[model samples]
Target: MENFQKVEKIGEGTYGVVYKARNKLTGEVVALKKIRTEGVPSTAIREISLLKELNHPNIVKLLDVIHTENKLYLVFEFLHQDLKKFMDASALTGIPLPLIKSYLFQLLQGLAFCHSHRVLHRDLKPQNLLINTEGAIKLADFGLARAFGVPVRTYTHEVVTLWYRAPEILLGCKYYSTAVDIWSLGCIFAEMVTRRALFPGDSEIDQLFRIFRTLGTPDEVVWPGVTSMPDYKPSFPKWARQDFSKVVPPLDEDGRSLLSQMLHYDPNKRISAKAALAHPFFQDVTKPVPHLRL
Candidate 1:
């Protein structure tokens, strides 16, 4: 830890406090995340192992790790701001369409890499997406992420944050897959255009209702096995599907089509990150692909 000098406190994370620091030798700026746990928590170990294997330009780099008796320090490449603050700064006007397209493309590229490696970023929100001054967006925070094995093992329903959480997860579906992240990406895509949460619900039930009201209530016809879900309720309010353009007017037909695919009711039918990259919405986006470090 002596190799670096702490510059200032950056922000609080899911696990611990983060700091902005500089390297003693190279003088390079970095983000230092201090994880204080009882001995060493499994989540910290999972983050270390997963981050070490994930090496993509759109993914935050884990430069190094320092372990003390009770605290573990994670060194990561520093970025100017998170997507949350960036969006908040432009709350009145909302994000421009071109920039939104670029950011969403970068996010999907990073998520595609994660899915390719069989890792699921259980939590995907604006707070976890870091933005650099150069307009590059990188995926960060892997505390809730884990690798999924073949045969698709059952996972916990309490994974993603409430607003961005998929409907299937909210209905107590344990056998989730990468589709969960795609659902979150859809929410983020809508937010980027409107500069506000598309589904701002107070609780789990409210969250589901928010989604249902917008996309219409799901049933056996629209979503197979939905009624069989552990948390599914027959008495739930039925909402007819609403127009997507009214919610996000700035988005064109292509963009709305892509978002709809991502927010599909059935996880099995949800668009994959790789497939989403080839969507017509990104037809005009021709940014150079960032070199994959690994």
Candidate 2:
């Protein structure tokens, strides 16, 4: 790890360019993330520190760190591809249902581990889920992720990808927890099965409406204080229950059931990443994860 070799620009990542480099001694191919230190990057430090505590097969492995000449170098285990690339190729062969289940199981496994340690993967999407050559999926990005847990609020409305973003976060509310990550996992599950985003809305308002029309409006009953949201306003013909069958016509009963459980109306009622792993939908997951890796 001490010995370094030449670096090559391999790919673009969440913040800055990622370089594919080699460890001269071990000769292990690794990803060196070189982020600009212009503005404060507490998130990066938090993530690196989190990785120091969490080492799992369902999570990307952090190999080494090099702070030399005023530059931060994060060396992570190299992955052959990600879900984005895997899904892109799925268009040709079409993603299999069983494979989708496998991915979900692995994703939830990783999320559950983070949740147990109070780490929130603020960003959860296809690009952030890496698929190694062995086909195991792992959560990657924590640049925007943080350590927060149930019954507490640690951040504002500044998490998740727009398409996969949770409704509560979108409503400009706080007091979010691992449930936010579950909602995102639900979105990613839907995307993997359908080979497209479940709610590909144009704007924030449009996005909310899209979800509302599909999943129906959340009230103070199922989701308390939803009506009190800062941007809460009436939508056209404020609706009723969303027919899961219609929303995920392609998914099987078990698949839809898991998706619904994760995308619960109330964050409190949403399924935990650990609980989700035991769902019947994963009865067919290729690599069953009864217990977490670490």
Candidate 3:
């Protein structure tokens, strides 16, 4: 820990304090998280462990972990900004569509990589996506992530952020797959296009209704066994499915198709991250991306 110098405090979250730090020897800018607890937090442990196994170009890199006299410090690659900051800054004039496509493509690449490894990034939102000056985006904040496999698994509904949460999760579906992340990706894809949240719901109920109003209320027909969810409301507000263009006018036809596939009501039918990446929307996107440096 003594090998680095703290530059400034970055932010605070449910985990711990994050700071911008500089390596004395290498002079590299890195992010440091300090855990002052007597025992290592489970979230901190999970993040460190998963990061150790996840060696993808689109995921944040954990450089080092240091245990000092009374604190545990984690070192990570320093990112310049987040998707939320980019969206907020360019909301008025609108982010260029091509850049939006590139960001979304990279986001899917990261997501596809995670899903392939059976890791569920339960929290997928603009705030958790880090961006660099070279236009590369990496998935960060693995506190809510988990590795899933086997016959079937039931997970907690209190996972993803409200706005980007999947419809099945909002309805209290315990046994959800990686579709939840796919739904979140769809929400983020739209937000990047419009420079505004697709569904900015206040509460869980409000969030569900906001989705229902746009996508229409799901039932056994569209989404089999949806009414069986523990928290399902029998007489929820209903509306017909709205046009995708109304929400994201600048998006082209193929883009809209991929977005719609990700935002499906049934988790079983929701598009997979890999499949979404292969959609025609990203057909023109070149592989072996540039600017993957730390």
Candidate 4:
């Protein structure tokens, strides 16, 4: 701990407060996540174990772990801002189509890596996506993430943020998979194009309605067993699906098609990260050469 000096408080994470710190010996700037519990929190343990196994360029790197008698600190490579802040700064002119494509491609690549490894990033929102000055983005915040197994076990529905939560999850379906992350990515993709949340809702029921109003209420025809969901109610108002082109006018046909697949109500039918990377939307989008610092 003496080897690094905390420069300033950066922000708060899911489990702790983050600080901008400088390495005294190497003169490197890093984010120090200080866990605010008596001992190591289970969330921290899950984050550490998963992050240790994830070694992708688009995933945030956990540099070191510093343990004290009463506190635990996690060191990570520093990034300038998050996707939400980036969108805020670009609110006037809006994010360009090319840039949006680039960011989404990078996000899909990172998600592909995680999903391929049998890991599910249960919480994927704009705030969890960190971006650097060079236009590179990294996936962060693995506190709610977990590894899944064959046959897919049942898990909690209260995972992702309300806005990005999958409809199946909002309807109280516990047997979810990587499709949950894809749904969030879909919301993020639309937000990048529109510079606003695709479905901003106040509560869980409101969120489901927001999505239903936009994508139409799901039934056994669209999503099998949706009616049998724990939270599903027969009296809920029915809504017809709206056109994606009208909803996200900024996106081109290819982009809208991709977003629709990502936002598919049926988890089994939603596009996988790997398949999404190969979609027509990204065919013309070139992968940016990663900038290497000396």
lDDT, candidate 4, 1-294, per-residue tens: 688888989867665688999999999999988765346455655556556767898999888766677676788888878888878877898877777889999999999998898767776889989887677888986645333111112122223358988888888886668999999999999998988899998888889999999999898899998898999999989999887678898678899899989988989999999999999999888645333231
> Which candidate would rank higher by lDDT, 2 or 3?
3
Task: Quantify all predictions' global Cα lDDT against the true fold.
Answer: 0.83, 0.74, 0.78, 0.81
Q: In candidate 3, where is summed lDDT lowest over 10 consecutive residues?
A: 148-157
Better of 3 and 4 by lDDT: 4
In candidate 3, clashing pairs total: 0
Summarize candidate 2's per-residue lDDT along 189-213 as a digit string, tens digits: 8887777898887778778878888
Segments of candidate 3 deviating more than 4 angstroms: 35-47, 66-72, 145-161, 286-294
Model 2 spans > 4 angstroms off: 1-3, 37-47, 67-70, 145-161, 234-237, 288-294
What is candidate 3's lDDT per residue for 1-294, written digit by digit as tens? 578888989876334688999999999999998755346455655556656677687898878777656676778898978878877887787767767778888888888888888777776788788988777889986544333111111122223358998888788777668898889889998988877788999888989999998898888899999999989988887788887789787789998999999998988898998888789998776433323333
Q: Give the higher-TM-score candidate: 3 or 4.
A: 4
Alpha carbon lDDT of residue 195, candidate 2? 77
Give the clashing pairs for model 2. none
TM, every model: 0.88, 0.84, 0.85, 0.88
Choose the strongest candidate by lDDT.
1
Worst 10 residues of 1 by lDDT: 148-157
Per-residue lDDT of 41-87 in model 1, one digit per residue for the tens?
A: 55556657656768999999988877778877788998878888878
Give the distance in Å from residue 264's predicted Cα in candidate 1 to where it truly belongs. Answer: 0.3
Q: Count the backbone clashes (under 3 Å) in each candidate.
A: 0, 0, 0, 0
